[PDB]
Amino acid sequence: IKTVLTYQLDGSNRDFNIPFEYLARKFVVVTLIGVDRKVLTINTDYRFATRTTISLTKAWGPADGYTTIELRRVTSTTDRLVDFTDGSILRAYDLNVAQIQTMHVAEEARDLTTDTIGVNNLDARGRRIVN
Amino acid sequence: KTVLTYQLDGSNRDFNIPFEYLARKFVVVTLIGVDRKVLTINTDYRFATRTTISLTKAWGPADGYTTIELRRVTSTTDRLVDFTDGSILRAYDLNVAQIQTMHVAEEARDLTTDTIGVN
Amino acid sequence: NVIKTVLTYQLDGSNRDFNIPFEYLARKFVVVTLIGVDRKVLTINTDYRFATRTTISLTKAWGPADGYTTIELRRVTSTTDRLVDFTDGSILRAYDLNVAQIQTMHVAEEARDLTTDTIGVNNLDARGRRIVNLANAV
């Protein structure tokens, strides 16, 4: 509740906030869904202004073709953050962030469910494909 | 089977539940297709034998409520266990820690399979 | 976006040998299947060696004529049978806490991956399934 959003963007607005908690600087991925998908890059174009608002250096509008930013919290399965070596004491904090991050993936699965088809009582995709 | 549907005759209340839960407020239980009525625990429903919802008393099916769809919703924010500096671990705990985060996963796949399905 | 643990290689005539990039925890957690008229599942110790750590030497040389168009494989981690279970000590090992955290990292990932895998946004909606019945043309 809720990882994936889309805002609304028009030009000269560049400061958009994150509702979730991110747990690592790279886990936010920021894509102007636009007409077409475009992934944005951690320093070139958006900087985290206050750890909870994403500033934008370039203030994109609909007029160069793009609405809107979709920011999900993609959490990698391979880049695990907590590794237990031979001791190397277990702080409780180590065991905490290990069970914290794996819940973060599991909840990201529950906001994947809204962004495929949906039943309206089915979607405005231009294509469905390979049959 | 993290979510199941239960329609039944009226003034009966002794539903059995499997999935199996961790906290009693994870079971959310609903009233159906005319409305989306979500009833609360202590105004309405206890659990009696820790596997039955024993409901409240009647409702069914007559008030447009045909009928109950109880389900798991585990909260992903309120972790049941916070590990602290020792404050020693119990082996029950080290399991239940990883047990809960596997249950969001079993929850998450199954409501996606209810739209267009796999099989 | 993007599927990390289900993958569909082009079977492409006689090619015996494909790679598996994701971090499968045990041998039996990878199920390989055959696509193209059927959904053929093929058992390990006879029909295909694990070539190496990361490679499936499939024996032999299926498709596409004589039936199957794409070898695909996915992870299936058992979400019930946990792999190391902690009892009273029984000292905590680095291997024990990791594999326990490794496994539940997969089950949440295998969930999130499976949810795109059914019908979901291609990087438009996708997959080579039959989309069995919708029952009316309007």
Residue numbers in the entry:
A (entry chain b): 5 to 125, 129 to 138
B (entry chain c): 6 to 124
C (entry chain a): 3 to 125, 129 to 143
Which sentences did the original study use to describe this structure?
Six trimers of the tail fiber gp17 N-termini anchoring to the adaptor-portal interface were clearly resolved. Each gp17 N-terminus is formed by a jelly-roll barrel and a 22-residue α-helix. The distal parts of the fibers, which are too flexible to be well resolved, were observed to radically extend back on the capsid shell at lower resolution.
Escherichia coli bacteriophage T7, a member of Podoviridae, has been used as a model for understanding the DNA packaging mechanism common to tailed phages and related dsDNA viruses. The phages package genomic dsDNA into a round procapsid using the portal in complex with an ATP-dependent terminase complex as the motor. At the beginning of phage infection, the tail is responsible for receptor recognition, and the portal and tail act as a tunnel for DNA delivery into the host cytoplasm. Here, we determined structures of the DNA packaging intermediate and mature capsids of T7 using cryo-electron microscopy (cryo-EM) and symmetry-mismatch reconstruction.
